[PDB]
Design a protein around this ligand. Sequence first.
Ligand SMILES: NC(=O)c1ccc[n+]([C@@H]2O[C@H](COP(=O)([O-])OP(=O)(O)OC[C@H]3O[C@@H](n4cnc5c(N)ncnc54)[C@H](OP(=O)(O)O)[C@@H]3O)[C@@H](O)[C@H]2O)c1
Length: 342
Amino acid sequence: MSVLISGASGYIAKHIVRVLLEQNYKVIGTVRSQDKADKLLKQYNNPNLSYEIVPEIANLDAFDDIFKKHGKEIKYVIHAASPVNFGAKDLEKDLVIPAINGTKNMFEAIKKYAPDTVERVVMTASYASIMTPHRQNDPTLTLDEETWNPVTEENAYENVFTAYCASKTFAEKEAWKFVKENSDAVKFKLTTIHPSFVFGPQNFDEDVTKKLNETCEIINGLLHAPFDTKVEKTHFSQFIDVRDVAKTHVLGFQKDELINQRLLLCNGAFSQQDIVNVFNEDFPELKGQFPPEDKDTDLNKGVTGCKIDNEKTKKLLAFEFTPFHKTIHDTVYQILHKEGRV
Ligand SMILES: NC(=O)c1ccc[n+]([C@@H]2O[C@H](COP(=O)([O-])OP(=O)(O)OC[C@H]3O[C@@H](n4cnc5c(N)ncnc54)[C@H](OP(=O)(O)O)[C@@H]3O)[C@@H](O)[C@H]2O)c1
């Protein structure tokens, strides 16, 4: 009944591991180094937790060794390893190849070493494989669980963000392709999770560092920006709370109605300024130590960009999502409390 989770040192995955351990699962995480494994084992201090070292998911047969050692005991796999790096300068090597090859490696290792043993795979895709990046501001576009980002290899590298979104899209396409082509040979059912921009506190307070993971660094950078920084007040994207994302991944292998589903995880549109407004509203004692409040945002004028039809996802998952204001509140409180400021 063990659960394997790839890329277990990241922001989202550390919450997923927390949830798995709350539910008394045996958990095997993959991390790039013994260094990171040691630190994580100390953080969780839980004997149900172990780590195996996968230094590079892009490399040849990267997940074979895990299923050679643990094939018999792994019943569920959460494939969460993929790079989120908006500073990437080698876009094929840094983003697209690890995304695709990590997915192919994980699925082929299962097929080779545990085809009748692994029952469910839950893959972290993204809202990025559903949305069209240059149409996030287009209210005539409606997205649902069957919509695909139409990016091609031809136009994927317009910039680092389209390249990251293409990495997500191409990896996901390979997963469904594998599932369709091996439905007779491998037992597992696939579920894909599609979070939008993920905010919320780090699983451990000690992981509030100078620079956070990419998506929470949006909040962290705004919170520490000089007062006169220019803050954009136009629609940016959709968000989802990291704790909702983690809860969804675990439900993903437990609930039969999530089999063969793409789950679209959005709970609200936002601008950078809507984030900053929470700073000022909820910590008025600190006003002036970060950019000021401004209620003239796209959101407040009824401007939310492309429309999210995730009613099916919300109905299947049944639990209520965390609202934007609380998600930002808890992210900011964690940082400022860590700093001794509140
Ligand atoms: N944050 C969001 O808004 C969001 C939205 C949609 C989907 N997702 C997806 O959620 C998953 C985790 O994202 P995150 O926000 O938690 O980012 P993160 O904190 O940077 O975690 C990424 C994890 O994947 C590992 N990883 C990345 N590339 C790897 C590679 N080539 N080889 C081995 N390990 C690799 C990372 O390990 P190292 O740190 O050691 O490199 C880390 O453990 C990703 O699949 C991401 O695409 C995130």
